[PDB]
């Protein structure tokens, strides 16, 4: 208990350091900036074909192909320009809650309640899509999966751990421990040297891929954390929680800058993503619609209300041209 | 409008759609059964009959394919993945009648679990089948061990019938939405082997109700 009191003593020191650095607020600096006008987005495409709830999606690096995972046991690679289905990959386990697209475009990944991440090879000598490797070693359900390159993947699981894999060997290169709850979301920094993880204990942590230790820890939320997204610069990230509240954290200041919460919203937040410039912050909610938040003044500037059930996945292209939202109504929609 | 390659791509997409529709039609025939039993509540006994995460059992009875999902291997929070199972035909629940004495008492924990899943947000219109297994030991244990040690508000004898009826009534009384949901209580008969028949009858009733709902007659 002596060490226990020391830990509380250090937490007092940590809080003092954070308060000493809070000379002002983000809301007091952007008081003279011009407000972003009413952002009206329309549905250009409606990608149909899924027969069950859509749980995740990811864009390719070419901003044209996207992969979607639904609980019917199917991965579909769509051509969003022409609404064509390039591929339809059948899964061995229909309980899939995550999907990923490799930066090169040769591999896609998926995972879920079966505690295995499956890597698929899209460009083979034959004409089918083959299962390359099945990464196992997690004792909990898989929440998110992101590619580092064609050989390394990072996986967040519900067993309070994140892991780094080497695909060619199938083993864990680095294992990340320190969360006290189920990890739900995971975002990679633009330099692929650091990544943030949000768990069920209302905490966000910054890890170091090459080293393997928790550089920083972030608190402030009151409930479960369901989404995380890196700022395009790489010195900030946004979180989404079940208490109808987004927040914008900072790495260099080690503090919370802004909170995006309204009074008429009481539902959870399922997906959080940014625009190309970082001025807009798209967020999906349980109330069947998505809102566009302005990241610098925390005032709502748009509502996307074309869906019939809970919006579960939301992504923005690499060039910022389109925002695609998928919901539990088995429809994807490309907004512009 | 379109080149030859674009037309062939459209044909490939249209064949993908046809195969997807065929797969969905085939999958709609199967019956989804969750088995969310309690700890040490005779789940091994209920999966013993069929005539590292989710464990799936596929058995057929009277030309109806049943897919049973044992999810008891998940040690994480139930709320985060409980919505993945909405749309199941039925939820098979197993409690141990011989765990009234063995203890936090197991029976009260089973009651809290049943109350948690019966009043859940996603399971308003999903029927729950309740199995009261391990009844052989209860017959001899009720004589030596009275039920009053666990249920002070009981005014019955020590016979097996009255105690079993009291347990069943208390388990069904935890239901709240008694308009679109039903509880099918049954005692596991090892020799008679009517468990599969009971599951078949419950699934048939659920299918009839769902068809009435879909036609517009409900």
């Amino acid at each position, epitope marked *: 208990d002596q060490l226990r009191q020391e830990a509380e003593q250090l937490k007092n020191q940590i809080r003092d350091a954070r308060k000493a650095c809070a000379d002002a607020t983000l809301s007091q600096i952007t008081n003279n900036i011009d407000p972003v006008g009413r952002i009206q987005m329309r549905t250009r495409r409606t990608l149909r074909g899924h027969l069950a709830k859509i749980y995740a999606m990811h864009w390719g690096t070419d901003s*044209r*192909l996207l992969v979607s995972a639904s609980q019917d046991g199917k991965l579909i690679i769509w*051509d969003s320009y022409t609404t*064509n289905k*390039v*591929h339809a990959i059948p899964l061995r386990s229909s309980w899939v809650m995550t999907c990923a697209y490799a930066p090169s475009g040769n591999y896609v990944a998926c995972g879920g309640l079966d505690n295995i991440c499956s890597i698929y090879n899209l460009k083979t*000598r*034959e*004409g*089918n899509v083959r299962v390359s490797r099945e990464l196992a070693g997690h004792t909990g359900y898989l929440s998110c999966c992101r590619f580092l390159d064609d050989n390394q993947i990072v996986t967040s699981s519900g067993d309070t751990t994140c892991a780094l894999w080497d695909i060619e060997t199938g083993q864990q290169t680095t294992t990340f421990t320190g969360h006290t709850g189920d990890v739900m979301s995971l975002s990679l920094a633009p330099d692929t040297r650091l990544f943030v993880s949000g768990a069920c204990d209302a905490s966000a942590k910054l890890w170091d891929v090459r080293e393997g230790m928790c550089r920083q820890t972030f608190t402030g939320h009151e409930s479960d954390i369901n989404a995380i997204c890196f700022f395009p610069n790489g010195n900030a990230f946004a979180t989404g929680s079940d208490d109808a509240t987004c927040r914008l954290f900072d790495l260099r200041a080690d503090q919370e800058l802004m909170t995006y919460s309204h009074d008429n919203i009481i539902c959870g937040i399922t997906s959080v993503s940014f625009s190309k410039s970082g001025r807009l912050l798209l967020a999906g909610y349980d109330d069947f619609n998505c809102n566009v938040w302005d990241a610098l003044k925390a005032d709502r500037a748009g509502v996307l209300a074309g869906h019939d059930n809970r919006v579960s996945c939301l992504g923005v292209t690499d060039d910022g041209m389109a925002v695609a939202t998928g919901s539990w109504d088995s429809f994807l929609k490309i907004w512009n | 409008t379109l*080149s*030859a*390659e*674009d*037309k*062939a*791509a459209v*044909e*490939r997409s249209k*064949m993908i759609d046809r195969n997807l529709r065929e797969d969905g039609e085939k999958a709609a025939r199967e019956v989804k059964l969750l088995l969310l039993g309690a700890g040490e509540s005779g789940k091994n006994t209920i999966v013993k009959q069929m005539k590292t995460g989710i464990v799936e059992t596929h058995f057929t009875f009277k030309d109806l394919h049943f897919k049973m999902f044992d999810v008891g291997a998940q040690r994480s929070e139930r709320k985060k993945w409980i919505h993945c199972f909405e749309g199941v035909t039925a939820i098979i629940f197993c409690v141990a009648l011989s765990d009234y004495d063995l203890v936090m008492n197991r029976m009260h924990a089973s009651m809290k679990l049943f109350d948690s899943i019966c009043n859940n947000k996603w399971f308003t219109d999903t029927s729950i089948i309740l199995f009261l297994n391990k009844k052989d030991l209860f017959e001899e244990k009720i004589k030596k061990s009275p039920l009053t040690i666990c249920y002070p508000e009981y005014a019955g004898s020590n016979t097996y019938e009255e105690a079993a009826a009291y347990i069943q009534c208390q388990f069904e009384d935890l239901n709240k939405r008694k308009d679109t949901k039903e509880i099918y209580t049954h005692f596991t008969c090892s020799t008679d082997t009517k468990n599969v028949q009971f599951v078949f009858d419950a699934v048939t009733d659920v299918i009839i109700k769902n068809n009435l709902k879909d036609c517009g007659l409900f």
Partner: single-chain antibody, 232 residues
């Protein structure tokens, strides 16, 4: 991945014959199939095309009416039934597979061929230079011209390049004028715009000798070129 064709031989004029091709090593049911024939001491010529799903069949006007194409998915075989064979049907028929989705590589694998000897509005592609004296090490540029603009409104220029080594089958090099085929060395580069195209090789070796063909795929029928020999 290999395609072996069986059949052919000596057929009297006015007769009938069936050519068979056996495919092993790849998902046959997902690939479209073509028939391309080469007359003795002449260029390539298109014959027929059958798609995946057997929902679209096209023939060349030369052979339309008497030639029939078919596929048997469960047995992994391709068929071509010929009736009333003329003296212009003597050639060595090759079987070419092709798949069409976004980012595909059509005309990627060719068969070995069967020799068939008988007794006795289309887009035109111009490859004027029939031969080039070459030395190993220098850069070689090979051009091919077109009549209609191959640049579609999508942004793709449907031009294809092929290599035929002496005693071998044609092999894909460049598809859509800019993308390299798999297994092709990086010394091959394709460029051009509108109706004029060129192909450049940086460092020529002793394995690059052969005949170069240019093909269009904007609309059917698919017309080949005349060839450019690259003897040393």
């Amino acid at each position: 991945v290999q395609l072996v064709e069986s059949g052919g031989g000596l057929v009297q004029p006015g007769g009938s014959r069936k050519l068979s091709c056996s495919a092993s090593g790849f998902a046959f049911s997902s690939f479209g199939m073509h028939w391309v024939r080469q007359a003795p001491e002449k260029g390539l010529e298109w014959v027929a095309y059958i798609s995946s799903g057997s929902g679209t069949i096209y023939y060349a006007d030369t052979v339309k009416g008497r030639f029939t194409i078919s596929r048997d998915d469960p047995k992994n075989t391709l068929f071509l039934q010929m009736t009333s064979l003329r003296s212009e049907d003597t050639a060595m028929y090759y079987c070419v597979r092709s798949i069409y989705y976004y980012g595909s590589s059509p005309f990627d694998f060719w068969g070995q061929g069967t020799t068939l000897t008988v007794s006795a509005a289309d887009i035109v592609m111009t490859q004027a230079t029939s031969s080039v004296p070459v030395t190993p090490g220098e850069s070689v540029s090979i051009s091919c011209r077109s009549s209609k603009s191959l640049l579609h409104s999508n942004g793709n220029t449907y031009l294809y390049w092929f290599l035929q080594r002496p005693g071998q089958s044609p092999q894909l090099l460049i598809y859509r004028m800019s993308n390299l085929a798999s297994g092709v060395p990086d010394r091959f580069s394709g460029s051009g715009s509108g109706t004029a195209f060129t192909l450049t090789i940086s460092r020529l070796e002793a394995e690059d000798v052969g005949v170069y063909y240019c093909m269009q795929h904007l609309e059917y029928p698919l017309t080949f070129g005349a060839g450019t020999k690259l003897e040393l």
